[PDB]
Amino acid sequence: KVVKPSSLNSDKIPYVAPTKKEYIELDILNKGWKLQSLNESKDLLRASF
Amino acid sequence: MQPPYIQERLKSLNDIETQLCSMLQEASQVTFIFGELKRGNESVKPQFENHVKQFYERLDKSTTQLRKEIQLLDENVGTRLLPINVNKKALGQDTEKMEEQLDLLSAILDPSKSK
């Protein structure tokens, strides 16, 4: 009822030029999140056991 | 009481679930130790090999002995505990409840034993 649906149309945007700046920070931040998941994993397994 | 064979069969089964409980406990300690191993103190590193080896050897032989118990379920059909027919007790309830009654009469019959 809001609108006749033709809303989403294909479009093109280029990929941002890569550098050391964000991938190494992202992958070590993901290491950090997965070390937290390992911690929570060990804690939950200990409580369950 | 139950005949000999069933008693050691239940003892072996009880040993089986106690071994399973020990396996779960050792899983708990190995999960515990891996956490600080990931935290990066290397002092408890040697204990890790021992814990893993004992965990696996506890997991294996328990299942192995439970394999022997199921072979013994199949193999003991009509076997070791051989049949016996010396009056069958569902009938022979009439016979122990004959005997004891007369025993009571004896106690009634002799006044010197009623003390």
Distance CA A33, CA B31 (A): 19
Question: B53 vs chain A: nearest CA distance in angstroms?
Answer: 20
Gap between the Cα atoms of A30 and A25, Å rounded: 9
Q: Taking the CA of residue B58 as centre, how many other CA atoms within 13 Å lie in the half-sphere pointing to its CB?
A: 18
Contact B28 A46 (CB under 8 A): yes
CB-nearest partner of B38 from A38, A46, A49:
A38
| Whether A49 and B25 lie within 8 Å, measured CB to CB | yes
Give the separation between CA B47 and CA B37, rounded to whole angstroms. Answer: 10
Interchain proximity A49–B38, CB inside 8 Å? no
Query: What's the per-residue H, E or C state across chain B?
Result: CCCHHHHHHHHHHHHHHHHHHHHHHHHHHHHHHHHHHHHCCCCCHHHHHHHHHHHHHHHHHHHHHHHHHHHHHHHCCCCCCCCCCCCCHHHHHHHHHHHHHHHHHHHHHCHHHCC
